[PDB]
Ligand binder design. Sequence first.
Ligand code: GTP
Ligand code: MG
Lengths: 585, 570, 10, 13, 142, 415, 163
Amino acid sequence: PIRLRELIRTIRTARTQAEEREMIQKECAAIRSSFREEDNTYRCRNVAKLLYMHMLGYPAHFGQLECLKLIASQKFTDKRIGYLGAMLLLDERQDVHLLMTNCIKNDLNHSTQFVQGLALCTLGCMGSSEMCRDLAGEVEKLLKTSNSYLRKKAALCAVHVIRKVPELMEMFLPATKNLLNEKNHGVLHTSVVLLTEMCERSPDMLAHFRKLVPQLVRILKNLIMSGYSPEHDVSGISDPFLQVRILRLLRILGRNDDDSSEAMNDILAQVATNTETSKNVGNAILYETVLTIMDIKSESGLRVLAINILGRFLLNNDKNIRYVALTSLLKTVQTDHNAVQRHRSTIVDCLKDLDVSIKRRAMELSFALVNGNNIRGMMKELLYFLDSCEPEFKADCASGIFLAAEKYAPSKRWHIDTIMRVLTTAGSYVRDDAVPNLIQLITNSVEMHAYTVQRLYKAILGDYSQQPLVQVAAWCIGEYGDLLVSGQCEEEEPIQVTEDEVLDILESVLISNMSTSVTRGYALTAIMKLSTRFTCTVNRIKKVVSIYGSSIDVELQQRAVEYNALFKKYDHMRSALLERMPVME
Amino acid sequence: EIFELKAELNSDKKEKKKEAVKKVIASMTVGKDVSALFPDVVNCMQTDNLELKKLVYLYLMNYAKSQPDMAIMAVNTFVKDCEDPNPLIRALAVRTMGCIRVDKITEYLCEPLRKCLKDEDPYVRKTAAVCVAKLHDINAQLVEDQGFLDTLKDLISDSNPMVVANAVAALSEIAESHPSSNLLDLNPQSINKLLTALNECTEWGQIFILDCLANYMPKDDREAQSICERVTPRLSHANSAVVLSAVKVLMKFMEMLSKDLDYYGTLLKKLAPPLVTLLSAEPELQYVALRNINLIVQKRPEILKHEMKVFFVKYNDPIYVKLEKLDIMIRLASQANIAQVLAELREYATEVDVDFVRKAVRAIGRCAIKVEQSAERCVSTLLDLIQTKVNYVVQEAIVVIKDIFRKYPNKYESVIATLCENLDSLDEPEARAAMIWIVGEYAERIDNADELLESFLEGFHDKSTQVQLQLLTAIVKLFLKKPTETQELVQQVLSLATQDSDNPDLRDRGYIYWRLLSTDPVAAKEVVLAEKPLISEETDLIEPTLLDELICYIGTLASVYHKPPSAFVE
Amino acid sequence: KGENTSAAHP
Amino acid sequence: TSYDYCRVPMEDG
Amino acid sequence: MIHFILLFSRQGKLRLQKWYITLPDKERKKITREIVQIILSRGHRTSSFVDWKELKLVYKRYASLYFCCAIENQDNELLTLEIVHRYVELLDKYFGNVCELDIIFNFEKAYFILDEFIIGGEIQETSKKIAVKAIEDSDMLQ
Amino acid sequence: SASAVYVLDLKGKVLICRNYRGDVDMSEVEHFMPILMEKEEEGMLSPILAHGGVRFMWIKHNNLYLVATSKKNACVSLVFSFLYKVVQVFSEYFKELEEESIRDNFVIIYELLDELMDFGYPQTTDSKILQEYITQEAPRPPATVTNAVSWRSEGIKYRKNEVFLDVIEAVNLLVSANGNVLRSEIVGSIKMRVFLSGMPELRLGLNDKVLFDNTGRGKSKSVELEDVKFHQCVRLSRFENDRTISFIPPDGEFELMSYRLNTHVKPLIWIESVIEKHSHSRIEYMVKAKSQFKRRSTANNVEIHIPVPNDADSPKFKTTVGSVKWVPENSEIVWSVKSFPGGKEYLMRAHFGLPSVEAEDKEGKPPISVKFEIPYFTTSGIQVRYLKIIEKSGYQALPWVRYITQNGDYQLRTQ
Amino acid sequence: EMRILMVGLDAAGKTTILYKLKLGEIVTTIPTIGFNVETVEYKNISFTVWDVGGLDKIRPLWRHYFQNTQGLIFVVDSNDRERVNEAREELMRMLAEDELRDAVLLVFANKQDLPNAMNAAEITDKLGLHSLRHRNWYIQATCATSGDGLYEGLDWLSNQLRN
Ligand SMILES: Nc1nc2c(ncn2[C@@H]2O[C@H](COP(=O)(O)OP(=O)(O)OP(=O)(O)O)[C@@H](O)[C@H]2O)c(=O)[nH]1
Ligand SMILES: [Mg+2]
């Protein structure tokens, strides 16, 4: 029965993992030999050893009986290590954590406030939705006291019982009434978090809670004007942890309101200029202030200064502040869309930053920045950016160019130009979900298909390994080859559309193993479609369907038989069912 | 800091500069940037001591590209050190001359290398033979201008066969990088001279001169048999890299014998025990041993067809041998050895490594596809492996039972009745669509096909492309086999397929099925439920034009990937 | 080693 | 080498 | 609402983990190993904010040992770094010149400071005095 | 054709590096351990790692990754047998092989990695011959390095002239879970200890079936050699002619021949066991051990391992003969019996506990693997017959032999 | 030293029995979802009694205490004739296992105040305790609110610990 730090020292004297596992299992078998002895003396350091074995990631499932037995002790350090073993060894789907219910409920009625401290800590950190339905009657009971050590823990345990059971939030409304004049800031902070969660859940609680807006306006006033405090102070600012939460409860109030929005006016006008803009902390306060301004129905005169603040944030060389500014303008895209667009040069300047996240947020900000005026000059730089990307940026950019293009295309020609340019330059990184969007938009087009399918065939003759490229291309050929091959029923003077390599390129897509077996489905479907679309060279593709008929893939083997029966037995039915497919939305 | 070390280096005492150069190469051991200490350790090089000059040669080797402009100050010392009565310092200077890859240096290094070629003591001869290839990789046409290739051929015509061995090694390496202009092939009398030089050199030279024979081809019957008569005792060698190249040239030359004679049969009956005893090596050789046995038994399967028992895996073996003995037992399962193979594959799915279990179930599938007398035992064993109801075992056994059915659809109607209860919370789309096909193709001995496809049609619009497409095939096949019970079912699966979904192949198949229903639903019995052709499988027996190319490359990186040697090198 | 450095202490 | 040896014949012509 | 709190070393070993979203054990070992791969492979002017899977993940380097948290992506970000800053100061003020080994050998007390500073995701004690005074009063009970 | 023979640590920094050609850049070693992790966690743990057009061949000793890079089409078994011979040479110098050696005996190991290879080619890899010109305590190189006979430097003299032969059986076996033999093969290895004077010649006399059939005495007791792979010292063409093992022996320890036959005589130690694995309670091992061979020999220090559940607890062991220690390091029992006579049966009955709450992952079913060793007895029936000393001097040497029966990988399967 | 379980249905007064054996009184008792554990010292033998919750969803999790168990207190309710079928089903799901195979059985028929409450023989032949084998069973009807027979049952239980 060694100590805990003895086990930590013995494990740190292991060299390779193939010996460190041996040293784990050595003392682990001693723990398991101890647990068949029912020793109630050494059991604290036994479960401490077991928790340190778990924190590396070794087997620790067997030691949950004894965490339940440590919580069912009577001494203090035993229950301490027991609730630690509960928070590390038990979760919602462990399926044996329900035996903690009686012990947590009794330890919410222990005389020492510290035992109830752990009994609120464990239920807050890992309480399941079926644990909360048996404990929320006592959770609100420990909010009905006034012991300030326990109110601050019961409030966040009530936040957790909101989070895991949303339909039980009505029995905490009568408890949270007029406790917002408490001088102790910890209970005040947890109550502001409780009000933020309650105001986030239901609008039925918004009408109950938007009456006490000037009360917490006064609280924020007495926190800002309190120049110094012995504790609570980080970098000369009186308790920013509660300042941001009060500004966030002010953010999610008055966002669709006029009276409460004007109630919170002049304190925002105060804190917008009374911010210590040197450290991290005051700029965090100022960013939260700008987010609170842009979400509530504020006066436009505040937003002048707020956009000036955001113009300053782009200039401050802390990359923290640059990520803050990119997230800022990414949030106020719709609200004040005009004033964001005059920061466009600075936004495009951030595309070459040496951070992954700065490039990501600047890319998403430029995508959300696209209006029906900036579509032209921005897409050249964006598709230059995509070709100059790194390969983990390509999916979000390839989806974003398509989403920005389908909304605000100035002309149908340049729209398909940009889309085809993206399908050439991206290749195996555009996601497979946007391919029906591309097909649906090009079939929404009615007047331009030759300029589509000619450039399609001029593109795919060089490459076929770009898989969504040929996913688009095989359907495009199969539905609009009649505009590709134009008036060429017999051999004429040579045009580059040739109706023999037009079929041979699909044959090459089929034969070559650079095919995702849905490219082959598209290709077979196009082969069968071009029997009616083309009267030029037929009964050569019937040979292809015939020689394709005993292939190994299942769906293609069904499709080849279903085409073979039509080409051999029911040729009077083939031209009747190869009508163009109707258009949906 | 390093100025102190350069001051120790600029001393005059021996036991100061010796500790200086040991401190330099101790910094270079961990890789401390000692590249500024180049132009002064060149001075403390021409020394009488020998345990010091190896360290200075090491420094010149590791920082030759590092100082491309200062490196000229060693060449006079090289041509001095290549003129010594103790041959060790000469051959050491020679093997350090070749590794220095600077084109300004190799201009002056030809004539002392020429002088060290024709030297007496064969140590420096066989070292200069390798230095010929060292120089040829750097600057090839300078070696052609200095006419070293004739002298390289002259060392093949020499006695004391280690000089001949390194000459053969450098010959093969130079003729590889050549465009085969003046190819270095030989008359058979020199090949008999190499066969006399095979019993005497080192065990590594007996790989090099068993790699020159990979480029020669004989012309006769008694010629090939006569040289293979003396290559044959080399297979009784312990060092298991010699055995592999001997197998390489025997597999090359056994395409020349007369098969009616008694030498080809005695060749086949003496080649199998060494290829089996290769499996008792140390395990990072057994991976290359298994990939080359894979390359052999596809070519000539008459060899190992009587010894299955050695390709059973053991629990001490790592993953890369456990994946490959499965492939070999696929390539060797015949009609006489079904029981031990299926018994052993039954005791492979009860492991914990998931990829091994998946590959073992696929091995059961390739066994049932390969031979036909034992598909019944394969189906019984696969249903027994489904009866543990572990998720990955079932998710591969479903696809394997499907691939048995698409090969052998005939007599398995009393089997699918258990397959309907198969824990249809089965998750992976590569097996759900397989179960959909199994229901749809065989919904006449399965009575409740519609009421399970209800469960597969609730979350229809977000599964996959393949699973939705198999549903669209299978429900139409169901309604064609039974039109009474599923009349609204075909309508609602078309309405989910044609109206709401914009998956384009799913729309195409949906409108094709809808137009076939609206035109002639009686004709669909001849259109979609036709007599399917017997499926030509994916025979992974490689191209014999490519397989005969990989006979020439056995024991190389082209012989593990099973790829041609131009498909992965750059 | 490198572990005995304290965290804060600017 | 606690297992003790035995002597073999040399010539055995 | 902090989803998890990770304390992982420079070499890749784990020193303190805490989960406020009850996801299962094999998912824990996938997520943890991937995030430890993500943060260790990044430069030194990259703003210490990583967008990882709908979570604006916040980390800060205070030693060879790294501290990692993840806030929910509609709240402020710099305050999560200041939460980590306060937790550094609480570990120092309870121990006294906090070391790596003091986090390693006395990890149970590091979890207890984390519990008396955070339950359920948020900050249950904004004072840097009352939390350490209460936890030393709890130790004063023993 | 390696371009750089590397020795890495268990992390990814370089213990010692030795490049030859310039085909592989020295910066390319830095990718080895991330590629190792990224290929190991997805089932693709292969000895040939890939980084673009740069390959990575490697073997793994205890703390060492002997990495061998290449860029072109390297001859692979050449490089792997080169790496194992480098391991055996370093174990001839340094009796253990750790990081304590490589970062401190770097005076001589760079010279060794210069000597063993030039331009990617293994050339001089015998340990004893490498000793007499590479020492840690320099003259002209010995001519034995250049000479055809390259494993015995002349001038060796001892006062007596002793030659010790050790014939080592090693039974490989894998009995299935029903009770039948799948594979009963024997990998035998004759290891010799030669202390002779000068340049002798030895011709080994075996009771081979093949040599007796060429002679006409294949009706007495003989051994069926299914395959034999000799050392380099044996002139193999003379063995090909008339089964004659002619060799100039090396000095000291070497391995003579590595034969491998099959034998359908019964297994030496039979392990019948039962497992009453009750869920979440306990487990019972009523295992019995009988010996099929004769009633005269004694099996020294056997170690009948039986793999157990991973997290069992409170073991009990009621035996009749021989001790038990339960070893939870590898989660195995080690049933050890020191003096084990032939033909008898020793019964053992274990009993554990097992945890209530079931695990997250399953545990696997490893096989029973015993570790027996018997002297003065061979299951094969092979007897060495003569050993002629040939010498220009001409004297009386003393060929001594003993017969050792060991195991190889003597596994028996479980339930 | 004797590990003792208190399994049984809900509303059976097993927690009433537990707090009557420990304290000596009848305290206010909520429905015990989890478990309870006390050490009651009686006839110089320490009885570690694991009182197990008797709600519906907890009944699968009862196997976690069946290990090292030397005796069983199986509390039934006497005013519920409509709950004896599920009680016997739970009982023969419990007593027929390899873990907890040598432990004695002590079934308590609590709550003997109403004419709905049966005697010991009727509850015995509703459980069919003569059909058991390799068990040292003994049922005992009790009155937990007055403490009737509980220490008598513990006296018999202490006879069953030693042999
Ligand atoms: N009259 C009478 N009532 C009893 C007696 N024992 C228990 N009860 C009643 O039975 C009811 C249920 O018993 P409890 O102990 O409170 O709860 P339980 O049966 O143990 O169920 P759990 O709490 O889930 O374990 C109590 O409200 C008591 O009033 C008894 O001996 N006499
Ligand atoms: Mg109760």
